[PDB]
Amino acid sequence: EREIHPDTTPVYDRNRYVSNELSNAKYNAVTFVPTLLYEQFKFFYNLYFLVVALSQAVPALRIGYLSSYIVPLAFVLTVTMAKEAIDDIQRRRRDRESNNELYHVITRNRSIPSKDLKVGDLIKVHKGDRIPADLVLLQSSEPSGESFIKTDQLDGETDWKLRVACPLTQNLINRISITASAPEKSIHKFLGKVTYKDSTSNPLSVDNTLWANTVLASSGFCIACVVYTGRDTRQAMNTTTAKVKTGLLELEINSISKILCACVFALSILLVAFAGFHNDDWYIDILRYLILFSTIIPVSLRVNLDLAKSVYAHQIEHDKTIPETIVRTSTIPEDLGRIEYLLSDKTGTLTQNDMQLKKIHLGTVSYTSETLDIVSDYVQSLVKDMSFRVRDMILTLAICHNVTPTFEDDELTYQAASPDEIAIVKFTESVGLSLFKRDRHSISLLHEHSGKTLNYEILQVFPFNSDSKRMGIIVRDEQLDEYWFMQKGADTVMSKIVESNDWLEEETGNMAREGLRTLVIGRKKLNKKIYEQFQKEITKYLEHDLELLGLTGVEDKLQKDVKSSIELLRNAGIKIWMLTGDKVETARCVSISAKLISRGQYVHTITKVACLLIDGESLGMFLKHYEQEFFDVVVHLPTVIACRCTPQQKADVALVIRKMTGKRVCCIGDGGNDVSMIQCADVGVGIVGKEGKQASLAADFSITQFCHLTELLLWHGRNSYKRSAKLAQFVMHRGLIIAICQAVYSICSLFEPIALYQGWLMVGYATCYTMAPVFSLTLDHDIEESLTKIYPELYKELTEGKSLSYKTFFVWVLLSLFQGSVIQLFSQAFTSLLDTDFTRMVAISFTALVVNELIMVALEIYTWNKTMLVTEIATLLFYIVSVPFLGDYFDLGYMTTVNYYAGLLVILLISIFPVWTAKAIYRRLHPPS
Ligand code: BEF
Ligand SMILES: [Mg+2]
CATH class of the missing domain: 1.20.1110.10 (Calcium-transporting ATPase, transmembrane domain)
Incomplete structure (x- = not known):
């Protein structure tokens, strides 16, 4: 338990809680x-x-x-x-150049550095600003209260996380006590309560919190009161103690x-x-x-x-x-010469975490980012048959999403929990039809292009689900008054339900061999009476038969020269692995699109309640119970790929590799999802380039990207x-x-x-x-x-x-x-x-x-x-x-x-x-x- 009063400044400023200063130097003066x-x-x-x-x-x-x-x-x-x-003073210097970042404080009425930040001060963090410590959302600029935090470095997830403000306390300015539970290593669990006057306890969970190396989005500002700071954070609790x-x-x-x-x-x-x-x-x-x-x-x-x-x-x-x-541990510059196992990360390390819809395929023809003028001149004529098919495809791409935009002076920015839809809508505006204000509580979607401003109102929505892999809505045009069921999802779910097509499977396989997270598209033409027949009511009626317009090819952008780097590091006898806390399907797509899995070369998969592709729970239970046998199996596979792993399992994989074989393990990464494995490897390498560089601050070496590990x-x-x-x-x-x-x-x-x-x-x-x-x-x-x-x-x-x-x-x-x-x-x-x-x-x-x-x-x-x-x-x-x-x-x-x-x-x-x-x-x- 941890109870915080934002008004009582001295009781936390003087003592009772850990200072926000971080320590990377190991030797102090008294024990030097x-x-x-x-x-x-x-x-x-x-x-x-x-x-x-x-x-x-x-x-x-x-x-x-x-x-x-x-x-x-x-x-x-x-x-x-x-x-x-020299190493200790340079580590202290490197830590203090990131401890002095300025953050607005409501009570202080003056910007104070991150080292001076304490627990319980109301910090107003902007859009493109890195989160200071473990914040908790209490007020959001958006009237709904939702904010999409960007957890690209707290964990490995490549999607934005839906974080809503506390519904009872967003309208409040007053001072309200925060009571959260004692810290643990749970990076996906949050417990606590918000206390107000007249004994009105409120529930808290993961849905209304922000963590250490996270980045906010989907607002202009938000009032958040720091709860965990220093070494009590969920980020620091997942980092093991550094060893010599x-x-x-x-x-x-x-x-x-x-x-x-x-x-x-x-x-x-x-x-x-x-x-x-x-x-x-x-x-x-x-x-x-x-x-x-x-x-x-x-x-x-x-x-x-x-x-x-x-x-x-x-x-x-x-x-x-x-x-x-940067060389941060000078005692080991020759271990880089004998590395046989490398354990890499995916987001930030391999992928830029900025995905763009590369190719759109429909009607046995394909349009890419190159030659986008054709789809542009097709979409501007919205207000032979392939022209209307392309028009309806772009209309679907601009309607079927769940993107909720916000407005600034110019250069509109999109916000959605699934950034593939954000890539879709950016593609649509690059074609020419730009998404605009959308209600998502009432029914309205605004769109315009080089012609006249469009308008669509939805009728009801079906939320995206993990086990469903489906996303569809029913929408009616304001100008034409036509009911369109407008629905999208994965290839395997729809190959048996979309239509009686013939060319779908070959194209899905062709682009899936390129590592693109393909989404097959669908549309159904409806009238009114069938809609209120549906509204009288399970899922059988809402999916009867569709019309396959085409499908979308969304790529996950890699960093500079990951192809050549992976090929050269596998030509040098280093058995490259890939452990990441991100989802499974995108990990497979990144692996195939980085030539980590070559042509053919069948991939095996384990998920507990040649190649390899293992879930985090399976790998954790295996290395908890079946160490020697499983590790004897995996040393002969050219690549082993792990997904949904807490940094503890990546650190334990490094420990097991360097213990059972007695060999040297390199571990490259960025952000706190791979600090422990960097510390527990025989060589740790960090990556800089974004608003968080703490893995590089805790690493033996530091390079700006993944292409430099080849020369390192x-x-x-x-x-x-x-x-x-x-x-x-x-x-x-x-x-x-x-x-x-x-x-x-x-x-x-x-x-x-x-x-x-x-x-x-x-x-x-x-x-x-x-x-x-x-x-x-x-x-x-x-x-x-x-x-x-x-x-x-x-x-x-x-x-x-x-x-x-x-x-x-x-x-x-x-x-x-x-x-x-x-x-x-x-x-x-x-x-x-x-x-x-x-x-x-x-x-x-x-x-x-x-x-x-x-x-x-x-x-x-x-x-x-x-x-x-x-x-x-x-x-x-x-x-x-x-x-x-x-x-x-x-x-x-x-x-x-x-x-x-x-x-x-x-x-x-x-x-x-x-x-x-x-x-x-x-x-x-x-x-x-
Ligand atoms: F990068 Be690992 F998932 F800690
Ligand atoms: Mg990372």
Whole structure:
């Protein structure tokens, strides 16, 4: 229960109810460090380098400089807090640019923003203005009191909802208390009561309410008192709590870093055991060796991953091909590269929700929107036989509807609960005969065109019904005084009752294969006496025999390039689904008209009290009871289509897809009918463009339409995943190659590998001499943006996990074994290892490592830009001018030797020839396309 008094301002303004401000940022100031630290320190490859850094606090485990094990931990902490702090402040900014929308308030007598709006203030909302919160209609501008709200984003419905004002309290201005029930998740149920003086309780229901992201129509203004605001709304109660999202590449890095830790621990144990278990502290040894080997990979991986993710977010949100795209969760820009299941919405996502009557067909000939002059010159002559047939068809289209128009200065606007009739009447006025004032309580319909103003009065009406699919009225002309029964409905209902025609079924099938919601038309000529014979009275008499004029083809307009987008995203192995809270037949028509269901390809259907097309109740009960079996059935169907689903079922479908198969789920949509599934997916994508953008406000990404998901998944995400995989490969290779060089020095000389790279050299390799060409790899792509359309098959080649697999990790480990062994052993052979040639050998080993990395970087570059050819040269020249001028004590040597340069050439050629020839043979046996 919730009782609201609009007059008692302070009792709700100060307290007692939730403020209208919404929150999209997750971390507040007081829990910014514990939540972020506890989220970042569950995974192994963060906790590992944290433990490595904390080890140096103990003086026994001191491997060397304290300015090499504490400063990169501080740097990763600074970068992480900066990234999530920027994300939180940007989320707060994005939320407040939509919290400041101005709304007229009756009691305040001054427009106040949406964030300042409270519960119980009389808001006067105009026609084209988005509803602030959960309003309740108490007064409407129309004398009848009906208002057609536009629930295109509260739920997925594509039809306007008939909302009448409260009949007892519309004529009232006075202050009246509102008592509604406590909030639930029921998006289609409303309960409450309106309280007036002298104990006159009134009933409330869904028919006199407006909800959060709804848009009003069918008026100029209406006096509505807010009842639910903030997180108590029916919109917010259907949104689940957002969870932290870690990419699957993060998990792959976690696993291969776990077994990298196992590998270096085994290498340390081997070195210590081969040493001879001397020095009386074998455990202190193995810990020191483990810290030595595992402090260059696990912390360089973090900086590279984090700043590469920042680079990916910047490069996503600064693309001219995808204008006005927003990255709201920068922790997962590479999950877009491995998406196999996509769960899309229909209204706003696929369809523009603006339907137009495309083709009119009558008498075995068809007229479309193109060549509309013929029907125009036919209708202007209203005041051979096909001319009168067309005239009567346009007359029927302008009479049989249930559109109730309203008047402005100009440019008349139509209002009807079934927008197909609105498309019909817009078509009629485009032909030339325009619908005008209609009573619908008394009997009058005005119409006029290029000629003289017509006039028709109805006699009685039959309302449209869901299970009937029929809409017909009896109308008499004022000028001609003729009784016409004028009646319309669906094809299947009338194919056996309209006439003895022959060409109807073929044309109905032909246009239904185009995804047009066809309506077959009918008209019956009557006189008076039979009418008052009918009026003396079930439905058998009112339907005896009609005359088939023709039928109407009403299309549901799709967004820009949904055909090509769906075809390309199904050519890339992504199993596109379609879950929507909208009706069933229009969902099927949209699916067929979007080529989501191709030619033939029979469609199955389930509705509880190849292809698929399932009702919301059926899917909900199945995923409540028969999870594994039904999901095993549906993974083989090319498309599964859901209808009439609360956001909970779409979120649960995403959860089940990512749980039973363990795969990544993308979910695109707009409005609050798909916020939960966006939050509960592995990737959430939002769409903007209309008066509500809350799904984009709660999403990981944001694009202006559906055509941009093709570039967001097939090109940006795939490149992001490939670049991150190559980055991790190169970082772990450099760490393992220095570890192998140290271990080979340990086996060839019993002192210690810690003594090999001491002081500046190890810090320089860990941070300065190698950080730049990895990010040179970060800015490289194999295929351009223009060719992400012609080759959607490149997206399929990443589904196995060959980029970061155990086999390729062990290939990297074996390659590091080979290359580091070559470097160290050839350095020892060319330097004649002693205690006096130590400087020369460590010099040649470090130079061999550096040039080895700088050549391996140039080997795995697909296309060469000027941000990559320059970075390599900059780092190489930095090393060249940093050997003498900075160190001057370590690794010193003559270095101007012909023998030394030949030795360096040999030790580098032997290291870089296996990888070059392996990629050459892999290119010449598996060419790319
Ligand atoms: F878009 Be789903 F129906 F939540
Ligand atoms: Mg929607």
